């Protein structure tokens, strides 16, 4: 005999425990491991890959028209092209991204991001943009004069056609006491500096694409279930 006694917590099924269990088929050799390309060991390898932002911010745009900003010769240079609120959890240009979707499986999320803006006009099309970054708790710019007084970059798309824009330390989480968000983690606003200058054979209406990825220091914890899906025909196919 070995004198034992049961503790509170004996004979309970805790769903998130890590115990060994009895194999149903021992002396069954599984199919051997074969080198399949592109293994993911860590979900932050998914987050650190670029993905297109839905930088259009309008409700009337449906489908693929969310993904681009159409700039043209009729744009009234003092106009804000797009502002990107840096809330991942809120609906906007970042909810439908890889950094957006994988961060909705986690509660607390914290790290740097990285934006890439690719201009997709003709080769001859010149002009400038002035991309900004407002830190959270700051004033989101409405004019171009307020834009050039922040952390900004003046981008001539002459031979240059993409800007990597490192965003420092976007953090946030969920709160209950929901009725609770983060109110800002920042903005990336873009203003026409000069004009869009096209030759007469090119189309006047050129377009941008915006990308976002995470950095080495982007981090996620306290895994939860993502609300992006919610509930099926022929669902009886298992039980019959």
């Amino acid at each position: 005999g070995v004198p034992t006694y049961l503790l509170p917590g004996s004979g309970q099924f805790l769903t998130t425990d890590d115990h060994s269990s009895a194999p149903a088929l021992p002396c069954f050799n599984p199919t051997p491991e074969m080198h399949i390309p592109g293994q993911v060991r860590n979900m932050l390898e998914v987050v650190q890959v670029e993905s297109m932002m839905e930088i259009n911010n309008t409700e009337s745009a449906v489908g693929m028209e969310r993904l681009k900003v159409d700039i043209s010769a009729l744009t009234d240079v003092d106009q804000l092209l797009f502002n990107i609120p840096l809330d991942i959890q809120l609906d906007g240009p970042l909810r439908n991204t890889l950094v957006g979707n994988i961060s909705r499986y986690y509660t607390h999320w914290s790290g740097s991001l990285e934006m890439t803006f690719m201009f997709c006009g003709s080769f001859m099309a010149a002009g400038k943009l002035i991309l900004c970054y407002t830190p959270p708790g700051g004033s989101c710019p409405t004019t171009r004069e307020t834009a050039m007084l922040g952390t900004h970059i003046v981008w001539d798309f002459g031979l240059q056609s993409s800007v990597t824009l490192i965003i420092p330390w976007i953090s946030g989480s969920h709160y209950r006491m929901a009725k609770s968000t983060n109110a800002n983690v920042g903005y990336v606003t873009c203003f026409m500096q000069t004009n869009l200058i096209v030759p007469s054979e090119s189309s006047d209406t050129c377009s941008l694409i915006g990308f976002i990825a995470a950095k080495d220091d982007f981090s996620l914890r306290l895994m939860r279930d993502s609300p992006d899906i919610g509930q099926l025909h022929a669902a009886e196919a298992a039980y019959q």
Binding site: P37, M64, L98, C120, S200, E201, S207, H233
Partner: protein
């Protein structure tokens, strides 16, 4: 210059390829020859650029998809072998070049989607044989924003992909390994990759009718096939 076998592609802009998932194609290893009897190595008949038909990239286009090896099951020495063998193992070397002037604009997304199980829009019936096996002529994305399977186009850059922005580059090259759970698989029954060329920014020019052609050249790499002849004693 891209020279494989007797086929060659001569163009000036090259050398920026995309080794898909970091893995260059190779033959089936010697410590994994526990599977079916010896894979042949033709090495000159099927490792060549099978240039598909050009597709008219216009303003109202939505996208194109070709499934591999379904695009090449009727074409030439790879098509003769597939319809006579039953197992294959091959990587691919895709070269997609979109030749436009300096007055055309637009961006393609030349993506290569492994195991692209398609869905059909607004029904509960699985897509049939002729909806998925299109052959060389390929398909057209009915809903390119969701990649015809409920996913997103925005997150489709998780795959092996290249960008043809006509302002910057006209070509794209993706080098695909043998991406499958099985060591060899069945070509007439399973489409192991899916090359997909989707607009993000549509084509545009002010002049006459706007049309640019896109050329797809798919060269199989490191082809293996099981059989043809064996020493029976």
């Amino acid at each position: 210059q891209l020279k494989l076998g007797n086929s060659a592609i001569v163009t000036q802009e090259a050398a920026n390829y995309c080794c898909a998932y970091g893995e260059w194609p190779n033959y089936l290893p010697d410590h994994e020859a526990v599977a079916i009897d010896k894979p042949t190595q033709p090495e000159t008949a099927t490792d060549r650029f099978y240039t598909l038909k050009s597709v008219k990239w216009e303003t109202g286009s939505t996208g194109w998809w070709w499934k591999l090896p379904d695009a090449l099951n009727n074409i030439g020495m790879f098509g003769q072998n597939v319809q006579h063998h039953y197992l294959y193992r091959s990587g691919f070397l895709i070269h997609v070049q979109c030749n436009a002037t300096k007055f055309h604009q637009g961006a393609l997304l030349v993506v290569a989607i492994p195991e692209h199980q398609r869905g059909a829009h607004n029904t509960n019936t699985s897509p049939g044989f002729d909806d998925i096996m299109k052959g060389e002529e390929g398909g057209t994305f009915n809903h390119p924003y969701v990649l015809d399977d409920g996913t997103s186009l925005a997150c489709a850059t998780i795959f092996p992909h290249q960008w043809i922005n006509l302002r910057t580059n006209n070509s794209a090259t993706i080098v695909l390994p043998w991406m499958n759970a099985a060591p060899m698989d069945f070509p007439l029954r399973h489409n192991q990759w899916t090359l997909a060329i989707i607009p993000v920014v549509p084509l545009g020019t002010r002049t006459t009718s706007s049309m640019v052609p896109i050329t797809v050249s798919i060269a199989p790499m490191c082809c293996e096939f099981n059989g043809l002849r064996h020493a029976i004693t």
